[PDB]
């Protein structure tokens, strides 16, 4: 699937439960894996609008070349049936 070899850290605490679950299944069903923890193996971190990241987390992300994206990265990639440009979904670089 389109998320082959992607490992997503999910920081989406403030999404409705149904949406959290849909993000997970969208990821799993299309070749990806997800965690709730941020570690060197993450390729991406998905961050809903109400969540924030510490400086520690941001340093880790930079160090490990992790892509920061909003949930629309997942939703719209699934919709277009194609992995989109994650650079268009960065809550820190609009």
Curated annotation (Swiss-Prot):
Annotated tissue distribution: Widely expressed; the highest levels are in the kidney; also detected in heart, placenta, lung, liver, skeletal muscle, spleen, leukocytes and pancreas.
Domain BRCT per the UniProt entry, residue ranges: 1-91
Coiled-coil stretches noted in the UniProt entry, renumbered to this chain: none
Domain of life, source organism: Eukaryota
Subcellular localization: Cytoplasm; Nucleus; Cytoplasm, Cytoskeleton, Spindle
Motif residue range(s): Nuclear localization signal: 16-22
Stated family: Belongs to the ARTD/PARP family.
Function: Mono-ADP-ribosyltransferase that mediates mono-ADP-ribosylation of target proteins.
Name of the protein: Protein mono-ADP-ribosyltransferase PARP4
Source organism: Homo sapiens (Human)
Gene: PARP4
Portion of the full-length sequence here: 4 to 97 of 1724
């Amino acid at each position: 699937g389109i998320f082959a070899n992607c490992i997503f850290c999910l920081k989406v605490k403030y999404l409705p439960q149904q949406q959290k679950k849909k993000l997970q299944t969208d990821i799993q069903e299309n070749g990806g894996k997800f965690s709730f923890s941020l570690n060197p193996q993450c390729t991406h971190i998905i961050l809903d609008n109400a969540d924030v990241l510490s400086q520690y987390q941001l340093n880790s992300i930079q160090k490990n070349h992790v892509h920061i994206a909003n949930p629309d990265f997942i939703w719209k990639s699934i919709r277009e049936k194609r992995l989109l440009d994650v650079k268009n979904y960065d809550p820190y670089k609009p």
